[PDB]
Amino acid sequence: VRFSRTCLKNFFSVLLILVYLLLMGVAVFLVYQTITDFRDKLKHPVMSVSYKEVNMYDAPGIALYPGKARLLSCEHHWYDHIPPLKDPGQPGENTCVTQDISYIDPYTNKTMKHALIVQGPRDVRRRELVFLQFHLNETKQDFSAIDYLLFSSYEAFLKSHDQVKFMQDCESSFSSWKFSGGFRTWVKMSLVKTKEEDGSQSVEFRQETSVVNFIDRRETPDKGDQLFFVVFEWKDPYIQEIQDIITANPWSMIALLCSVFLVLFKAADFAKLSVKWMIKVRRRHLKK
Amino acid sequence: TCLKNFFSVLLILVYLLLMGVAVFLVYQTITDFRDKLKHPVMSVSYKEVNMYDAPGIALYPGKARLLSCEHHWYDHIPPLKDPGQPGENTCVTQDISYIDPYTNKTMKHALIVQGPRDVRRRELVFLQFHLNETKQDFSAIDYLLFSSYEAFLKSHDQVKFMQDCESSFSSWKFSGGFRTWVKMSLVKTKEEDGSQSVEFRQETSVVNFIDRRETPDKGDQLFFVVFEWKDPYIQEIQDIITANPWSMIALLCSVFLVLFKAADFAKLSVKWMIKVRRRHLKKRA
Amino acid sequence: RTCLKNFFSVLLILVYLLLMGVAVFLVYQTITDFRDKLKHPVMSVSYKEVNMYDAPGIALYPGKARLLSCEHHWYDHIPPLKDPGQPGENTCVTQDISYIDPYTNKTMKHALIVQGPRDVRRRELVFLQFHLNETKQDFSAIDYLLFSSYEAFLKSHDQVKFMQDCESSFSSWKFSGGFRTWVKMSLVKTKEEDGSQSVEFRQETSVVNFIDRRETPDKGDQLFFVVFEWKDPYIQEIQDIITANPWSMIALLCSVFLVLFKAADFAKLSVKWMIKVRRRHLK
Q: What is the torsional sign of CA A160, A165, A169, A171?
A: positive
Distance (Å, whole) CA B33 – CA A262: 25
Give the H or E element holding residue B186.
strand B179-190
Partner residue opposite B80 with nearest CB, options C136, C179, C249: C136
Partner residue opposite B254 with nearest CB, options C140, C243, C255: C255
**Among all residues of chain A, which has the CA nearest to that of C82?**
A142
Of B252, C31, B193, nearest in space to A251 by CA: B252
Q: How many CB pairs under 8 A join A and B?
A: 76
**Among all residues of chain C, which has the CA nearest to that of B45?**
C40
B104 and A CB contact within 8 Å: no
CA distance A258 to chain B (A): 7
- Which C-chain residues 133-152 have CB contacts (< 8 A) with chain B? 136-141
A180 and B CB contact within 8 Å: no
Distance (Å, whole) CA B113 – CA B125: 10
Surface-to-core class of residue C7, CB atoms within 10 Å of its CB (0-12 exposed, 13-18 middle, 19+ buried): exposed
Residue B56 Rama label (left phi>0; alpha psi -120 to 50; beta): left
A107 and C CB contact within 8 Å: yes
Contacts of A258 in chain C (CB under 8 A): 255
Residue B60's DSSP bridge partners are: B142
The full DSSP string for chain C is: -HHHHHHHHHHHHHHHHHHHHHHHHHHHHHHHHHHHHTT--EEEEEEEE-SSPPPPEEEEE-TT-EEEEEEE-SS--------TT------S--EEEEEE-TTTSS-EEEEEEE-----TTTT--EEEEEEE---SSS--EEEEEEES-HHHHHHSS-HHHHHTTTTTSS---EEESSEEEE-EEEEEEEE-TTS-EEEEEEEE--EEE---TTT---S--EEEEEE--B--SEEEEEEEE----HHHHHHHHHHHHHHHHHHHHHHHHHHHHHHHHHHHHH-
Contact predicate C144/C60, CB 8 Å: yes
Tell if the CB–CB gap between A258 and B261 is shorter than 8 Å.
Answer: no
Instruction: State chain A's maximal CA–CA distance in angstroms.
Output: 127
Contact predicate C248/A37, CB 8 Å: yes
Tell if the CB–CB gap between C258 and A260 is shorter than 8 Å.
Answer: no
Residue A89 Rama label (left phi>0; alpha psi -120 to 50; beta): left
Residue A240's DSSP bridge partners are: A51, A192
Q: Residue B67: how many CB atoms within 10 A of its CB?
A: 20
Per domain, the residue ranges of chain B are 2-13+22-39+246-283, 51-238
Instruction: State chain B's maximal CA–CA distance in angstroms.
Output: 126
Of B238, A44, A244, nearest in space to C237 by CA: A44
Residue C184's DSSP bridge partners are: C204
Q: Which CATH class is domain B51-238?
A: mainly beta
**Among all residues of chain B, which has the CA nearest to that of C202?**
B203
Contact predicate B78/B88, CB 8 Å: no
Distance (Å, whole) CA A84 – CA B109: 22
CA distance to C16, C124, C258, per residue, from C20 (Å) = 7, 70, 12
Residue B224's DSSP bridge partners are: B128
**What are the φ and ψ backbone dihedral angles of A269, each rounded to 5 degrees?**
-65, -40
Distance (Å, whole) CA C168 – CA A12: 69
Partner residue opposite B208 with nearest CB, options C173, C177, C252: C177
Surface-to-core class of residue B193, CB atoms within 10 Å of its CB (0-12 exposed, 13-18 middle, 19+ buried): exposed
Distance (Å, whole) CA C146 – CA C242: 32
Tell if the CB–CB gap between C137 and B212 is shorter than 8 Å.
Answer: no
Q: A27-49 burial, b for 16+ CB within 10 Å, e for fewer?
A: beebeeebeebeeebeebbbbbe
Tell if the CB–CB gap between B39 and A48 is shorter than 8 Å.
Answer: yes
Distance (Å, whole) CA A242 – CA A240: 7
Could you write out the three-class secondary structure of B136-160?
CCCCCEEEEECCCHHHHHHCCCHHH
Contacts of C254 in chain A (CB under 8 A): 259, 263
Q: Residue A75: how many CB atoms within 10 A of its CB?
A: 19
Of B197, B151, B146, nearest in space to B170 by CA: B146
Residue A191's DSSP bridge partners are: A205
**PDB experimental method:** cryo-EM
Residues 6+ apart with CB under 8 A from A151: A60, A61, A63, A157, A170, A174, A205
Distance (Å, whole) CA A211 – CA C209: 11
C46 and A CB contact within 8 Å: yes
Q: To 10 degrees, what angle do helices B247-283 and C246-282 make?
A: 70
Contacts of A252 in chain B (CB under 8 A): 248, 251
Partner residue opposite C210 with nearest CB, options A140, A143, A178: A143
Contact predicate B205/C205, CB 8 Å: yes
CA distance A243 to chain B (A): 9
Partner residue opposite A212 with nearest CB, options B140, B255, B261: B140
In angstroms, this model's resolution equals: 4.3
Give the H or E element holding residue B206.
strand B196-207
Residue A133's DSSP bridge partners are: A73, A229
